[PDB]
Amino acid sequence: SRIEPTNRAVLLPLGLTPEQVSQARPMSRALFDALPVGPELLVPEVPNAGGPATFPGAPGPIGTVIVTPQISGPQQYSLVLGDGVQTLPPLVAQILQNAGSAGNTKPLTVEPSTLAKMPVVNRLDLSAYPDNPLEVVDIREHPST
Amino acid sequence: SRIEPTNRAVLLPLGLTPEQVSQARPMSRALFDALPVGPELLVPEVPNAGGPATFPGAPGPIGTVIVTPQISGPQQYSLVLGDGVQTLPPLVAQILQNAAGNTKPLTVEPSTLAKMPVVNRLDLSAYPDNPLEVVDIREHPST
């Protein structure tokens, strides 16, 4: 899967470093053709971002990140789309906040009883990203693949 | 034990998610008959909530949750019932605490609570000790 050194929002939560990526070693043409191609590692493209929500009681404009308070149980992040809310894995929520920051550093905390009223929707893939940090192998020690 | 997707009150302390609940794979009619049933995973209903307690020294009305600390170990939770108070485990109390309601339970002294009449009337058989470790069906296709 492809990745770019300019995108700081993805490199940091994933566990990569701009220098580390730039100093990567060459790949043979023979192995380049053998490995199948996977989806690209980029910031998720949430549609129609910034507009008002269709459903009532939405905690914020379309594309905002919502979370529920720790005192009620383990925290579940979610994204508010136009017609409902889609759940988010812990690792993607960090990427969305970092990229969609525009100065903001944290999500909106909302009570369970208000969440239960919002309809559930599914319109984003989010299957490409792992659920925990990458254990990048040190190529100097293992120079063969 | 049966479960529902809209009930955030019970899902959130248990660890499940509406997607993970609504997208589960099918079950055979044969396996459904071999398993015995269990009570539904719901917020346990309290009879005559808000009514007056029958025992003396009652910290509050029926349906209220009471808690007491200790010199060592975790805090002990309890619920007011028409005939007294029933002690509840930490995970169960979160179900009640999560469904609108009081900001925090009633804090009380250990000695008075020890003298208070203990009750065993509600059934907590279907509730676990920690968030469930749900088995990934792609790796385990057979049960």
CA B63 to the chain's CA centroid = 13
Distance CA A57, CA A116 (A): 11
Spatial separation of the C-alpha atoms in residues B138 and B25, rounded to whole Å:
10
> Do residues A80 and A93 lie in contact, with contact meaning Cβ atoms separated by under 8 Å?
no
Q: How many residues does chain B have?
A: 143
Only one residue has tokens 């000790």, namely: B129
Residues in chain A: 145
Method: cryo-EM
User: Could you give the 3-state DSSP secondary structure of residue A78?
Assistant: strand
Longest dimension (CA), chain B: 56
The resolution in Å comes to 3.8
Query: How far is Cα B70 from Cα A28, in angstroms, rounded to an integer?
Result: 66
Phi first, then psi: what are they for A18, rounded to 5°? -50, -35
d(CA A76, CA A80): 13
What is the rounded distance in angstroms from the CA atom of residue B7 to the CA atom of residue A48? 29
Chain A residue with the nearest C-alpha to that of B100 = A113
Residue B62 near residue B53 (C-beta atoms within 8 A): yes
- Token look-up 């029933």 returns B86
- Nearest CA to A79 out of A131, A121, A130 is that of A121
| Chain A residues closer than 8 Å to B129 by CB | none
- CA–CA separation, B138 and B134 (whole Å): 12
Tell if the CB–CB gap between A72 and B13 is shorter than 8 Å. yes
A42 CB-near residues (< 8 Å, 6+ apart):
A4, A7, A10
Alpha-carbon distance of B104 to A75, in angstroms, equals: 19
Alpha carbons B55 and B113: distance in angstroms, whole number: 12
Do B46 and B81 contact (CB within 8 A), yes or no? yes
Contacts of A45 (CB under 8 A, 6+ apart): none
A86: three-class secondary structure by DSSP: strand
Q: Which residues pair with B85 in a beta bridge?
A: B80, B118
DSSP string, B54-94: SSTT-SS-TT-EEEE--SSSPPEEEEEETTEEEEE-HHHHH
- Is B67 an 8 Å CB contact of chain A? no
**Which residue does chain B place closest to A120, by CA atoms?**
B18
Best probe of the B interface among A86, A113, A114, A127, by most B CBs < 10 A, is A113
Considering only CB atoms, B17 lies closest to which of A76, A112, A113, namely A76
Residue with tokens 């930490």: B90
CB-based contact B17:A76 (threshold 8 Å): yes
Instruction: Tell which B residues from 27 to 46 touch A, by Cβ distance under 8 Å.
Output: none
Question: CB distance A116–B8 less than 8 Å?
Answer: yes
